[PDB]
Design a protein around this ligand. Sequence first.
Ligand SMILES: CCS(=O)(=O)Nc1nn(CC(F)(F)F)c2c(-n3c([C@H](Cc4cc(F)cc(F)c4)NC(=O)Cn4nc(C(F)(F)F)c5c4CCC5)nc4cc(-c5ccc(C=O)c(F)c5)ccc4c3=O)ccc(Cl)c12
Ligand SMILES: CCS(=O)(=O)Nc1nn(CC(F)(F)F)c2c(-n3c([C@H](Cc4cc(F)cc(F)c4)NC(=O)Cn4nc(C(F)(F)F)c5c4CCC5)nc4cc(-c5ccc(C=O)c(F)c5)ccc4c3=O)ccc(Cl)c12
Ligand SMILES: CCS(=O)(=O)Nc1nn(CC(F)(F)F)c2c(-n3c([C@H](Cc4cc(F)cc(F)c4)NC(=O)Cn4nc(C(F)(F)F)c5c4CCC5)nc4cc(-c5ccc(C=O)c(F)c5)ccc4c3=O)ccc(Cl)c12
Ligand SMILES: CCS(=O)(=O)Nc1nn(CC(F)(F)F)c2c(-n3c([C@H](Cc4cc(F)cc(F)c4)NC(=O)Cn4nc(C(F)(F)F)c5c4CCC5)nc4cc(-c5ccc(C=O)c(F)c5)ccc4c3=O)ccc(Cl)c12
Ligand SMILES: CCS(=O)(=O)Nc1nn(CC(F)(F)F)c2c(-n3c([C@H](Cc4cc(F)cc(F)c4)NC(=O)Cn4nc(C(F)(F)F)c5c4CCC5)nc4cc(-c5ccc(C=O)c(F)c5)ccc4c3=O)ccc(Cl)c12
Ligand SMILES: CCS(=O)(=O)Nc1nn(CC(F)(F)F)c2c(-n3c([C@H](Cc4cc(F)cc(F)c4)NC(=O)Cn4nc(C(F)(F)F)c5c4CCC5)nc4cc(-c5ccc(C=O)c(F)c5)ccc4c3=O)ccc(Cl)c12
Lengths: 220, 221, 220, 221, 221, 220
Amino acid sequence: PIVQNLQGQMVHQCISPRTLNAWVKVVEEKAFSPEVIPMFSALSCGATPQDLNTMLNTVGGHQAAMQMLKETINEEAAEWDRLHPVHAGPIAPGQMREPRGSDIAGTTSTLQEQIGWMTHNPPIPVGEIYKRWIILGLNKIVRMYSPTSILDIRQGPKEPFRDYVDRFYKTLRAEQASQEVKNAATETLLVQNANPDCKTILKALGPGATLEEMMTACQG
Amino acid sequence: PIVQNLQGQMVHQCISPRTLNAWVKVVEEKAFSPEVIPMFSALSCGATPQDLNTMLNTVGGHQAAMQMLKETINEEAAEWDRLHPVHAGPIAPGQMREPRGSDIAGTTSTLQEQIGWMTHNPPIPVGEIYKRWIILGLNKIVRMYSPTSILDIRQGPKEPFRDYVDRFYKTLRAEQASQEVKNAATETLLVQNANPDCKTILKALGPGATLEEMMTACQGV
Amino acid sequence: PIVQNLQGQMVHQCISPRTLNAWVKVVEEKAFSPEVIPMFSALSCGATPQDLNTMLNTVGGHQAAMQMLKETINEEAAEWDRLHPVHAGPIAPGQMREPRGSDIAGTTSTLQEQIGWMTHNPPIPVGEIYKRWIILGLNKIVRMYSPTSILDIRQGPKEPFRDYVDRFYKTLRAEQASQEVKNAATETLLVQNANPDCKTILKALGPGATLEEMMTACQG
Amino acid sequence: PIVQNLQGQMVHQCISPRTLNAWVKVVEEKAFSPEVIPMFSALSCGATPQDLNTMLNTVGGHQAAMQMLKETINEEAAEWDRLHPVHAGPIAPGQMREPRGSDIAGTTSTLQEQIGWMTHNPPIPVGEIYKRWIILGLNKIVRMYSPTSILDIRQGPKEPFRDYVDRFYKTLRAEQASQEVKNAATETLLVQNANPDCKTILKALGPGATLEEMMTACQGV
Amino acid sequence: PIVQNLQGQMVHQCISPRTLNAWVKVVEEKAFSPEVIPMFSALSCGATPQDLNTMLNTVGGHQAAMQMLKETINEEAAEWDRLHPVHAGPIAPGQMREPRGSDIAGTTSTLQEQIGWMTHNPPIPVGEIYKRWIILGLNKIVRMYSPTSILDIRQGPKEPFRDYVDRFYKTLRAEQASQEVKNAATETLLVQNANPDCKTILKALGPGATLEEMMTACQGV
Amino acid sequence: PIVQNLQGQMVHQCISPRTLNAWVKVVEEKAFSPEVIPMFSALSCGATPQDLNTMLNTVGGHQAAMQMLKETINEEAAEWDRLHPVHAGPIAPGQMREPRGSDIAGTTSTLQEQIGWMTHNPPIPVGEIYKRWIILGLNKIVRMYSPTSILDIRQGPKEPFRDYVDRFYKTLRAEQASQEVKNAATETLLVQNANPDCKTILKALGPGATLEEMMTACQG
Ligand SMILES: CCS(=O)(=O)Nc1nn(CC(F)(F)F)c2c(-n3c([C@H](Cc4cc(F)cc(F)c4)NC(=O)Cn4nc(C(F)(F)F)c5c4CCC5)nc4cc(-c5ccc(C=O)c(F)c5)ccc4c3=O)ccc(Cl)c12
Ligand SMILES: CCS(=O)(=O)Nc1nn(CC(F)(F)F)c2c(-n3c([C@H](Cc4cc(F)cc(F)c4)NC(=O)Cn4nc(C(F)(F)F)c5c4CCC5)nc4cc(-c5ccc(C=O)c(F)c5)ccc4c3=O)ccc(Cl)c12
Ligand SMILES: CCS(=O)(=O)Nc1nn(CC(F)(F)F)c2c(-n3c([C@H](Cc4cc(F)cc(F)c4)NC(=O)Cn4nc(C(F)(F)F)c5c4CCC5)nc4cc(-c5ccc(C=O)c(F)c5)ccc4c3=O)ccc(Cl)c12
Ligand SMILES: CCS(=O)(=O)Nc1nn(CC(F)(F)F)c2c(-n3c([C@H](Cc4cc(F)cc(F)c4)NC(=O)Cn4nc(C(F)(F)F)c5c4CCC5)nc4cc(-c5ccc(C=O)c(F)c5)ccc4c3=O)ccc(Cl)c12
Ligand SMILES: CCS(=O)(=O)Nc1nn(CC(F)(F)F)c2c(-n3c([C@H](Cc4cc(F)cc(F)c4)NC(=O)Cn4nc(C(F)(F)F)c5c4CCC5)nc4cc(-c5ccc(C=O)c(F)c5)ccc4c3=O)ccc(Cl)c12
Ligand SMILES: CCS(=O)(=O)Nc1nn(CC(F)(F)F)c2c(-n3c([C@H](Cc4cc(F)cc(F)c4)NC(=O)Cn4nc(C(F)(F)F)c5c4CCC5)nc4cc(-c5ccc(C=O)c(F)c5)ccc4c3=O)ccc(Cl)c12
């Protein structure tokens, strides 16, 4: 990673054995449950492209997913190249060549170049750009290994309303839509997929009941 | 988190794997037992909004609780906005735009903005403000998911007084109320709901007895 | 905690996940065995009142004990208030308001105030004062969850003298008396509660035998 | 390893017990699965030749592989020597003798010489040069100890396409070849070795379909 | 402990949870096996008296041993007091009162006094002096709780000589005696208490044989 | 150990609980398998003589081996004394007495003297010298607890050639000879001890086949 030391300077540090192991274990234990994304995001804080590639290369199995991720990266890289074309010419002392997409993904760039960009004044944050690409791919994978649509989450006749709501929002976490789309669909669908006794009570509350009010109302 | 270096400046440090894992495991092991709240507060010391979002996003399951938490945050954010409305205009050099509620929650703010607020002179402690909102939400969840009401804690005929007291205060810990209200509940119910023999002993020691005295007086009864 | 950094200045640091976990595990594993006190004392090295409250708030169960602790704190705080009454008036630049008992316990004081006191020149060590109150309460709890009096520790007829002595002093650790009182009672009671064959030998050694001499003498 | 201190100088640090143990355990648990290679590369970041030798010397068992690794290193060392022959003469103050192949591998060089190379201005990165040799050797071992050939990965009649793709790329990961060669193997075999129903679907999407599209198109077939 | 910072000054650091737990677990697992002594000495490196008291206070059980340890300390403290009596009078600025035995053991001294002694120029190393007393006490305990006497270590008829030697030196390790005395015990008993066949072989190699030679000579006998 | 701090100075640090535990566990788990030597070497990086003695004193059991180690140290120390005799006289301010062998082994030297030597300009690296002595002894012990000669490692009739080669080189790791002696013996002995079907194929390859070529040739 690139971190600040105790004396106020951005420096390169080795990825730690703890970080590496934390990520490997997360994938082993949880596969591509939604929570693997914020865990990846937090474990990769400060990462260079080389560090990100290391993390992705240590994933055991799941190589269909990992290839889909490479394809997502390649599409983002091609968009970057269209938007930020490289001008040819000798690079001046006191300057860094402009990165292409393949450089941000660490494929055609050296570690020294990556540090150069990430610590330039002003910085070209190739780590952060690459990470955003990876997260877009990881979201696709989460959605793909999600077994269930929110349309199929229905409260059972004897199912406590809290357990139903737990299942509903856990399923929703795996959907790949904006938060606004998720929320408004949810309002109405949560009621619609409730069991007849709860649905009755929930209709009675009227629009604009908070979840807390809903869960109190259907406690038994 | 934001921590101080040797130069005496506040700077950003990455959240540690140890922290992340400690939080994940505490939720796994304890759910929304009252002690999850101080563990959250301790593990999130110095946290940015981004860090707090990370910690909440890694909670496995309990999504009904997490959704109720978001709703609490949205309520606290609307109030923030009502009390502290943003004034339009360009931001001066070395200065920071005023945060809206959604900026404090990390939704409409970048990491670099959060660092800027938390390290400005004087600080706008958006991490601390957000943590307060989160803790309020967690207190609701703890209460919400408490199985027992304090009114139903009654000493059994053969139950040692110490075990009853343990159960009474464990229940009271999950209530969402000020300390002064919880002290009123104790004064109303603890002696009253003791069993007949202990109750007789306790009524005799009177209102002013310490818990240690009460527990000594009922050691056999 | 408040610690010294590498460059010679008292600064606030976050309580570490290790410290938190060590304390939680100690209580889970050992409850209020006497050794929990020096473990609390060592894990709370440098603690602010806020840190101490955190540690106490993480104790799972044992809420009768924890309430007795709060009552002990309140009594110590009232004594502090009697001994160190607060004078009213505006606080000068370059000064800290005088702490009341409720401030030392962290109830009516902010973290910023606690750091202010603990790093003033000269320091008001509100962490150390509060800790002393907590330890007084913890000692009361140890004594309370001690099942056995030293008067009931008697060497059995076939019990190796070493096992008896182990039981005796382990029980004595849980008693709440001064060390002088513990020692002198012990001299005589250890002999008196020994089994008839050992008691014979121990009488024969005369007064002022060390424990080592006693344990050698009753080895079989 | 060689790491930077506050003065901005590169200095020597002892290899940590955590690092040592992480490497030992990864070999124990995963043998020469492809993912052992990036784990080695990450755990050996900043390593001196001495450190790399330590890590290789602590591998338990697998001595046939380790001997093949030494042979690869000896081949790379002979080539180094052919490209970069040492010139005789006394070494000037503040300067370092030019390394031979055996110096890079840590066999004929002291720790103090390795530090001198890695911290000189500009660096002679003998740790990085040796790591490259080691990684080449490990890639041979991974391939050598792979059980399956890519030609024998064929989708079963009832095998979900996702499971076949997992197996195909897991096999391809163990091949020792450039990325461009591995991409050629995919273009030759993946659709061709799908089962009859999936293959029909995939041939219709055509050469330009992404894996995500292919996996959507065969979700039931 | 007292450790050095960057300014090259000795300063106080809190005892770490790792240290505390390592000590607790070593006693739990090994009791008063001889190797507990160097583990104590290593874990208490730089310790103040306060720290040493903490480590001793966390020992679970073994209170007969711990009481014998206190008695040893009291004996060493009385001797200290006899050799180094305190002189009355007010302490000058930047100076420290002379420690009594009970000050070294941490009983009548504050932490701030201990820091003052250990960091004064020149140091009064009250941590090191106390550790010496503690180690003397622990050596007594190890000996006290050793099950076997060296006189009873005898090679069995079918016991490999290496196993006998292991047992002989493991027993000798628990003895409380100088190294020169332990070397005398070896010269008296090791060959003498070997079985008839090994003994014959060993007597022939003679007094000057190394252990490695002795163990080679008896590899089958 | 003696390490460099962040501000470029050689200082003494306490041996860490991690280091201590790593070494204890290695011996418990692996005894004196060859890999215990590079593990000792790496865990003792920067060690003083006192640290090395600590590490050796924590070894549980294996006291025959440990005594053989002391004997090896004593022989190396006597050689050092013959080669570097100590001249008598008062030691000047700005100087360190010359170390004898017993000083390098930490037996007659204080920690303060060891730090003095290791941080003198120019350094007398008593830690590194002692470690070399210990490693010579440890190699003797490895060879001694090795159950098997390389002459007895023979490929079985149905044994995969890779498993045979694994056994052969694992056995060779425990032999105490130079690397040149190990290699040249190995070339020929590996073929000679192969089973008849492999030996046939290996003869056919001719001299100077690499191991990789040999293992490919006998894959079935
Ligand atoms: C033609 C280019 S492309 O294919 O379109 N895109 C890319 N190719 N590469 C890899 C490369 F750089 F090599 F071209 C790309 C990398 N890439 C990679 C990637 C990282 C990755 C793994 C993953 F699981 C998912 C991902 F999304 C990304 N690893 C692999 O591709 C391994 N692989 N291999 C096959 C398979 F082939 F076996 F099937 C599969 C996989 C994962 C899924 C299936 N590792 C590196 C390691 C060192 C590096 C360098 C040195 C050392 C040691 O000294 C070291 F350990 C590592 C240096 C540079 C790179 C680097 O740039 C990044 C991004 C793109 Cl988009 C590509
Ligand atoms: C739209 C307004 S709102 O919904 O009324 N309020 C909020 N929306 N958001 C989320 C968002 F920001 F997306 F709008 C909000 C966040 N928010 C979130 C929150 C954090 C959170 C989780 C939790 F379990 C309880 C909570 F109380 C808070 N995560 C979710 O909402 C996930 N989610 N999702 C569903 C769902 F699927 F059902 F939808 C559920 C959940 C938990 C319960 C059910 N994560 C972030 C991550 C990155 C971030 C940025 C970058 C990376 C990668 O580098 C990364 F990993 C993360 C950047 C910004 C944000 C951010 O701002 C904060 C607060 C509010 Cl109040 C809101
Ligand atoms: C009228 C005052 S008093 O009651 O006489 N004395 C005290 N009240 N308080 C608590 C308070 F401050 F709230 F008044 C007191 C505290 N106190 C507490 C204490 C700590 C404690 C726990 C314990 F197990 C034993 C103890 F001895 C002490 N916690 C509780 O009381 C919890 N509780 N709750 C009930 C029960 F009610 F459910 F039954 C029980 C318990 C333990 C036993 C049974 N936590 C804090 C947390 C934040 C803090 C602030 C913010 C956040 C988050 O942002 C956070 F996580 C923590 C800020 C300030 C405080 C603080 O000052 C300290 C000392 C006194 Cl003496 C008192
Ligand atoms: C002679 C030339 S060569 O053989 O062609 N090439 C090499 N010989 N050496 C080793 C040596 F240096 F000794 F010559 C070489 C080393 N080398 C080694 C290597 C490292 C290694 C292990 C491995 F598993 C795979 C590898 F690829 C490399 N260890 C071994 O060879 C052990 N070995 N031993 C047998 C055997 F028993 F079967 F022999 C086997 C093995 C692994 C497979 C089978 N360790 C060192 C340790 C100290 C070192 C120095 C000091 C201390 C103590 O303080 C310490 F612990 C270690 C100092 C210097 C060296 C050093 O230079 C490096 C590279 C080459 Cl190519 C060679
Ligand atoms: C009176 C003179 S003496 O008895 O002859 N010698 C000594 N008395 N003390 C203890 C004392 F200081 F209290 F006098 C002595 C200490 N001593 C102790 C010792 C340490 C110890 C434990 C052990 F297992 C073996 C030992 F050899 C030494 N603990 C005990 O005595 C506990 N104990 N208690 C009984 C008993 F219950 F049976 F009594 C037993 C035992 C072990 C065996 C049986 N702890 C301290 C803690 C705080 C300290 C201060 C503050 C806090 C909190 O913040 C804290 F947690 C701790 C501050 C000061 C002290 C301190 O000075 C040191 C040395 C002497 Cl020689 C004596
Ligand atoms: C006449 C000298 S010699 O015998 O020829 N050589 C040596 N004697 N010593 C030890 C000594 F220094 F004491 F003389 C020697 C040491 N030596 C030792 C050694 C280390 C060691 C252990 C081991 F397992 C293998 C080894 F190779 C070396 N420990 C023992 O000898 C223990 N022992 N004991 C018996 C047995 F006797 F019970 F059987 C056995 C053993 C291992 C095998 C069988 N520990 C020290 C600890 C403190 C030290 C000082 C203070 C404290 C506490 O405050 C502390 F914890 C440690 C201070 C100084 C020393 C120190 O110098 C080093 C080297 C030589 Cl060659 C010798």
